[PDB]
């Protein structure tokens, strides 16, 4: 996360770290959506241009974390994966359309002060809140700058959703309805973005109707990190919810 701040303790208790077993390293962010299911970006698990194709046994999830590198004894919980599900129409060849995946844990994780699931949006919450200018929050342990470096603890940044024509005009990539973009404009006097290593983590909004946090987006892509005139692109979770529900109903 570029131009963010340290998270408060328990500020993002749905935050998940995807951790490679060997070598031991950060792979991606992710989020907890129930006691058995974790949501992330497909490109965290499958990205052939970069020779990325992880299987279940390659990875661990670490839940309840704050420090990036520490083993947070008596706080974090480490879970093994039972199965990965990547969206069948994920488009890694062109534009990262439908950049979404689910991971089922081998055993349910116990909730605590530090471990708690985020809500997935309903149609009405999505319609109300996914509007230009409305701000969401992005969290992760990814790099602090595009070129360098890396944070001691989880980072947090609040960013406004951007008008779709501005998103489209910022890139040569074809933007789809399964994406939205967020970030400040050059003239706006504030900045911030996701970066490498933040992939797969959540873009959340706090509903003013029921005071619950909803995951509206997944950290997907950006041309660099925090570049003037570029924006971060997020998977539109609500638009892909029917698939989420089909997977959980069939395999949960």
């Amino acid at each position: 996360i570029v131009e963010g701040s340290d998270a408060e303790i328990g500020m993002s208790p749905w935050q998940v770290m995807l951790f490679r077993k060997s070598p031991q390293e950060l792979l991606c962010g992710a989020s907890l959506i129930s006691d058995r299911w974790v949501l992330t970006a497909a490109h965290c698990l499958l990205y052939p241009p970069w020779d990325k194709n992880f299987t279940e046994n390659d990875l661990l999830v670490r839940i309840g974390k704050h420090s990036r590198t520490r083993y947070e004894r008596n706080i974090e919980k480490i879970s093994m994966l039972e199965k990965i599900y990547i969206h069948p129409r994920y488009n890694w060849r062109e534009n990262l359309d439908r950049d979404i995946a689910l991971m089922k844990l081998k055993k349910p994780v116990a909730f605590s002060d530090y471990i708690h699931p985020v809500c997935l949006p309903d149609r009405e919450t999505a319609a109300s809140l996914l509007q230009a200018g409305y701000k969401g929050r992005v969290t992760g342990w990814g790099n602090l700058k595009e070129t360098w470096g890396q944070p001691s603890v989880l980072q947090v940044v609040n960013l406004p959703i951007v008008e779709r024509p501005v998103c489209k005009d910022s890139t040569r990539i074809r933007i789809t309805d399964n994406m939205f973009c967020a970030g400040y404009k050059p003239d706006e006097g504030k900045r911030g973005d996701a970066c490498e290593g933040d992939s797969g983590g959540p873009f959340v909004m706090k509903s003013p109707f029921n005071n619950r946090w909803y995951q509206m987006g997944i950290v997907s892509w950006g041309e660099g990190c925090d570049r003037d005139g570029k924006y971060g692109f997020y998977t539109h979770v609500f638009r892909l919810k029917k698939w989420i529900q089909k997977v959980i109903d069939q395999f949960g």
Partner: peptide, 11 residues
């Protein structure tokens, strides 16, 4: 750069 995690998780 990461602190070793307990061996139980790597089995």
């Amino acid at each position: 750069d990461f602190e070793e995690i307990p061996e139980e998780y790597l089995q």
